[PDB]
Design a binder for this molecule. Structure first.
Ligand SMILES: C[C@@H]1O[C@@H](O[C@@H]2[C@@H](O[C@H]3O[C@H](CO)[C@H](O)[C@H](O)[C@H]3O)[C@@H](O)[C@@H](CO)O[C@@H]2O)[C@@H](O)[C@H](O)[C@@H]1O
Ligand SMILES: C[C@@H]1O[C@@H](O[C@@H]2[C@@H](O[C@H]3O[C@H](CO)[C@H](O)[C@H](O)[C@H]3O)[C@@H](O)[C@@H](CO)O[C@@H]2O)[C@@H](O)[C@H](O)[C@@H]1O
Lengths: 307, 306
């Protein structure tokens, strides 16, 4: 039976699994009042990828395909290809293409394109509104708002590189993005399919432990908070190890290597998320070189020490 | 601890010199120029070299505060560390970790947040790593942007890289130059603490490159980008730190579908790969193919022609 383990990377060394930026901190808070059902950063401890999760940290919230100009506008519809430029299959048993954004918001970035025959290239500021009626990645199409009505060519490889998020400054501050509201992946008036399940702590006194980043903001007053259930490196690690789960819960200790001391302990649930014994919103204060270590598999009644 | 390499496929892995996926394996001669990249540099037993760090998404990013150059749309960034700690120029490295390791014009976006009210802004930005004022080692780099007033002083500012550009009115694909290192402390300075240049030593052997195509944002750039190790291999070795039993690790590239070895190669302890081939060649491989460590070999092992 291959032993289970987690990477020895520090929080700052690891990557958010829901946007291509580093982790900054560990955060716990209550979540009874909203649905925690992210589709990126979803992986079982024995390495089965779930939702829209894929292995590349840099392909998260990227798009590739060809673009068609929406006449009379600076908008373009992208006909999606897969990450390796192969055809996208809309019948695949997934919510949307792997790495598709899993929150409702306005993501700003850059659309780049290369003309195959002469190698000429171009790049333009572009925004994708994932709450848009025309955000339908599951169907293989998404709409980009750009600063040109003529520069992009048809039938040429085009990429969207994400940078950050924006908000309307003339409306309530930090009201968008909404990190826990899933897009409708097939556009307006449709129901999402094949979702990784929503997660919640069940044990008394426990809350989710989030791996938190701050998304860059590009305009207005966005809510830049972004919480993922697992670091991308953990997804990569579990996928590779494929260590069988001996119980439903892996007990982890967060340790200071300088002192050999446990700062706190937590439960890594087999279906791919972490809980801690704490009540309320709290930014964890940790030593920068601290990291997680697998302790042992525990039964369903194990009680965590307060953190 | 036994040595090993990841079982990830080439397409599943990431370029260690720019934050984009690997696309293919490529081999070619390199006797006539210096191959001395500073990112994607790691020994098989887990020692990081050059400007190499672990995060794939921090490669070619910059963070700090910016000062406006009056009479211009250019800004000087006073660099901080990736975690917003003070940058220490006395640290024994060539430059801040993840600094670009080639001379070219990198286009991206400068973003900023105003601490007090959470107001935010983003602007097109280019950094010319061959510029006299490109001095990341001293803690300063210059960005050319599309604004002369929007960025504030003393506020956290980040550069997210997107791609490279070229001047279309000059010879096509003449820039970037992926094998020309910047002068990290600016014009008329000498680099320090570099990861060494690499070359095959065995007769008939060439380097094996892990190749990507950088996005192009304007003109006719040379978008080829070759790294010596995937970023995931760097990550793997750093954590495993498995002792090297010799200077050369024999790898087999195998198809899990049939079990046939397409080819074998040498993973050198100091962190690069060679193969038995003469000439330029894009390798044809199956997407589900991967590398497997078989054994440690001595200095005299002759590779099967590839
Ligand atoms: C909160 C505010 O967000 C950004 O300003 C935007 C405006 O952006 C436009 O004007 C600004 C200068 O005010 C700048 O020139 C930018 O390049 C340009 O696109 C505009 O989108 C309005 C419309 O609602 O919203 C905000 O005022 C940012 O530029 C500011 O620095 C500031 O953070
Ligand atoms: C080869 C060429 O590169 C890019 O064009 C640039 C020019 O970029 C400016 O004009 C173009 C239209 O040609 C476009 O409107 C763009 O938004 C704007 O910045 C310009 O930088 C010149 C200067 O010598 O070089 C190129 O012509 C690209 O936009 C084109 O599609 C094309 O690939």
């Amino acid at each position: 039976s291959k032993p289970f383990s987690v990477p020895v990377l520090t929080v700052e060394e690891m990557t958010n699994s829901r946007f291509p930026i580093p982790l900054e901190k560990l955060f716990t808070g209550p979540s009874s009042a909203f649905v925690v059902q992210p589709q990126n950063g979803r992986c079982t401890t024995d390495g089965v990828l779930l939702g829209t999760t894929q292995l590349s940290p840099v392909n998260i919230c990227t798009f590739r395909g060809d673009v068609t100009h929406i006449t009379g506008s600076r908008n373009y519809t992208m006909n999606l290809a897969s990450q390796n430029w192969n055809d996208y299959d809309p019948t695949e048993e997934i919510p949307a293409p792997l790495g598709t954004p899993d929150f409702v918001g306005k993501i700003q970035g850059v659309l780049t394109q290369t003309t195959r025959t002469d190698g000429s290239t171009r790049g333009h500021k572009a925004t994708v509104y994932t709450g848009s009626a025309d955000f339908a990645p599951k169907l293989g199409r998404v709409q980009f708002e750009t600063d040109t009505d003529r520069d992009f060519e048809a039938n040429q490889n085009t990429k969207f590189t994400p940078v950050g998020v924006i908000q309307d400054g003339g409306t309530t501050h930090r009201n968008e993005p909404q990190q826990w509201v899933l897009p409708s992946y097939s556009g307006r008036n449709t129901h999402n399919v094949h979702l990784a399940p929503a997660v919640a702590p069940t044990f008394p006194g426990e809350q989710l432990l989030f791996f938190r980043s701050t998304m860059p903001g590009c305009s207005g007053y966005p809510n830049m908070d972004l919480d993922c259930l697992l670091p991308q490196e953990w997804v990569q690690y579990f996928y590779q190890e494929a260590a069988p789960a001996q119980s439903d819960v892996a007990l982890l200790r967060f340790v200071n290597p300088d002192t050999g001391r446990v700062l706190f302990e937590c439960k890594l649930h087999k279906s791919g998320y972490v809980t801690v014994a704490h009540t309320g919103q709290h930014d964890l204060v940790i030593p920068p070189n601290g990291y997680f270590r697998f302790d042992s598999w525990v039964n369903q009644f194990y009680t965590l020490a307060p953190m």
